[PDB]
Amino acid sequence: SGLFITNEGNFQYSNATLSYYDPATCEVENEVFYRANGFKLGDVAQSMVIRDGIGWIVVNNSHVIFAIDINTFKEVGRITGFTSPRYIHFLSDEKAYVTQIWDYRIFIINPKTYEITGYIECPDMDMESGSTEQMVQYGKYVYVNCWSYQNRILKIDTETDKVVDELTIGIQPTSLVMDKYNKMWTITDGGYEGSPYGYEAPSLYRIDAETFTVEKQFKFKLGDWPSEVQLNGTRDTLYWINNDIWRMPVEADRVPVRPFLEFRDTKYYGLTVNPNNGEVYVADAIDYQQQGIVYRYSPQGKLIDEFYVGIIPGAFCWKL
Ligand code: NA
Ligand code: NA
Ligand code: NA
Ligand code: NA
Ligand code: NA
Ligand code: NA
Ligand code: NA
Ligand code: NA
Ligand code: NA
């Protein structure tokens, strides 16, 4: 088994990289895409998904998704022409969605043929400030958060590839997961000081998937800049970043008083939970300039291992 770490590098400097970690040996290999291919990913490696032996790496500011063999790391294909891609969600072997920033459309692709095959137009959205981000599936529907300069979750009918509903919440929901009770969780970042769109106290929401209604809202503090909801494998413990790493049972009616991992005046930036053994990996960007570090914790918050990765490690992908 193994773990991929994407490193965004510094936006507009083309220093994104890919790392691979073997939890059995506690060994990391850095710059593995370069090592295998003899050229680099580009600018802002954002996310990665594995399906059927192929890893799909989204390079947000290089207009491309690379497909690699998960064992040799060699490029086996790519899809180009994306405005500014974010996340990939597969509906079948021949259809996936690829969300975008700076676009009002979600690209449809055929992963088998490496082609763009359609577009989904989002309502009340333009290229100048458009954003679609993470996706969860609920039956024939996909829910998607709209992050940058947006304040919505959209609901897409995957039969017709159409947006069929929307829910307005606090500004800039960052991320989206679905728990075992078919409740979605999203956490907003609250914008930023001087934003043209807004700056506010951010919130964590629990949203019923069936009825698309907010059930819980936990509001934090003005100045907080949270992100990155994540679930354990059984989808009953939620983790997120808000300075510290926090977690709580998805049945909770109150937020925790003690964090999983205390803030240490660095930059916790990426987060995953091993879906089989519950170990928690925290990617620390440190100061957004130096080489980042990943910290690996037991389910009880004891440090098992830590290892240097690339610059601004932001996402993980499990190879199971
Ligand atoms: Na980069
Ligand atoms: Na979009
Ligand atoms: Na935007
Ligand atoms: Na986006
Ligand atoms: Na907000
Ligand atoms: Na904020
Ligand atoms: Na800025
Ligand atoms: Na997530
Ligand atoms: Na990320």
The CATH number given to whatever domain includes residue 219 is 2.130.10.10
Measured in Å, residue 286 CA sits from the centre of ligand 9 at 15
Measured in residues, the chain has a length of 320
Residue from 236, 247, 268 nearest 204 by CA: 247
Q: What would you measure as the largest C-alpha separation in the chain, in angstroms?
A: 51
- Angle CA 99–100–102, to nearest 5: 160
Q: Is 27 annotated as a binding-site member? A: no
Structure tokens, 38: 């003899």
Measured in Å, residue 237 CA sits from the centre of ligand 7 at 33
- Angle CA 236–87–125, to nearest 5: 110
Method: X-ray
Q: Is 225 annotated as a binding-site member? A: yes
The resolution, in angstroms to one decimal, equals 1.5
Structure tokens, 317: 């992908």
For residue 79, tell me if it sits in a domain: yes
Q: Is 56 annotated as a binding-site member? A: no
Report how many domains make up the chain. Answer: 1
Residues, Cβ < 5 Å to ion ligand 2: 100, 103, 130, 132
Measured in Å, residue 196 CA sits from the centre of ligand 3 at 11
CA distance 99 to 174: 13
* SS3 annotation, the chain: CEEEEEECCCCCCCCCEEEEEECCCCEEECCHHHHHHCCCCCCCEEEEEEECCEEEEEEHHHCEEEEEECCCCCEEEEEECCCCEEEEEEEECCEEEEEEECCCEEEEEECCCCEEEEEEECCCCCCCCCECCCEEEECCEEEEEECCCCCEEEEEECCCCEEEEEEECCCCECCCEECCCCEEEEEECCECCCCCCCECCCEEEEEECCCCEEEEEEECCECECCEEEEECCCCCEEEEEECEEEEEECCCCCCCCCCCECCCCCCEEEEEECCCCCCEEEEECCCCCCEEEEEEECCCCCEEEEEEEEECEEEEEEEC
Residue from 255, 259, 307 nearest 281 by CA: 307
- Angle CA 42–45–48, to nearest 5: 130
Q: Is 185 annotated as a binding-site member? A: no
**Region for 73 from its dihedrals, namely left if φ exceeds 0, alpha if ψ lies in -120 to 50, beta otherwise:** left
User: Residue holding tokens 């594995």?
Assistant: 50
Q: Is 240 annotated as a binding-site member? A: no
Q: Is 148 annotated as a binding-site member? A: yes
With contact defined as beta carbons under 8 Å apart, do 153 and 143 qualify?
A: yes
For residue 257, tell me if it sits in a domain: no
- CA distances 241 to 140, 224, 244, Å, are 30, 10, 6
Measured in Å, residue 286 CA sits from the centre of ligand 6 at 19
Measured in Å, residue 266 CA sits from the centre of ligand 3 at 26
229 - beta bridge partners?
none
For residue 245, tell me if it sits in a domain: no
Measured in Å, residue 218 CA sits from the centre of ligand 6 at 15
For residue 279, tell me if it sits in a domain: yes
**Which range of residues forms the domain containing residue 21?**
2-235+266-283+292-319
User: Residue holding tokens 């999203």?
Assistant: 186
With contact defined as beta carbons under 8 Å apart, do 122 and 140 qualify?
A: no
Measured in Å, residue 140 CA sits from the centre of ligand 7 at 38
